[PDB]
Amino acid sequence: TEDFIKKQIEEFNIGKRHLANMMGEDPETFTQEDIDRAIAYLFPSGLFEKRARPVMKHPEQIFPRQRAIQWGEDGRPFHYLFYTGKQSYYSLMHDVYGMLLNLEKHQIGSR
């Protein structure tokens, strides 16, 4: 939710400034690499699985992309393909099919 994520982001900024101060570095130029190095030094963890070790990443990275609400206060969904249950995928397929239709009407190192 927006309130939770905003609180997490502000807390992360404040903690970033505290970490810069603790390591005696400029709060403004302190980067994600500096944060990671400082956290690694302060909390040494030999656990092989890197995901298990201490981490102070941005809340955007830490938390998953929890999807927003799809219908407003009136209960009316926003995407006309909402009831398909896969609105994003089916809208993408619809766009691709429309592009193919337009092409038909008018007429290497990448995986």
Binding site: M93, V96, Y97, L100
Partner: protein
């Protein structure tokens, strides 16, 4: 009591006895003589013969109808026209 060398007689063309024998076997199979001999080797009791004939007729009906359906739907084997939908 019939004239010989007229019934079930095939003239081999240019010495291809393989082809001549295959054609003769096809003729006998179409006329059903091979199946007749194979069944007549041992007596087929009338009840068993009736059951086999009924089973063969049902199998023929089902297979002919299935072939009709397959041929009728063959045209629909074409590539999907509405790909993407």
């Amino acid at each position: 009591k019939h004239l010989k060398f007229i019934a079930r007689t095939v003239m081999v063309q240019e010495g291809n006895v393989e082809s001549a024998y295959r054609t003769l076997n096809r003729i006998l199979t179409m006329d059903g003589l091979i199946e007749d001999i194979k069944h007549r080797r041992y007596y087929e009791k009338p009840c068993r013969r009736r059951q086999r004939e009924s089973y063969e007729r049902c199998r023929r009906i089902y297979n002919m109808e299935m072939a009709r359906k397959i041929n009728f739907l063959m045209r629909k084997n074409r590539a999907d026209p509405w790909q993407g939908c």
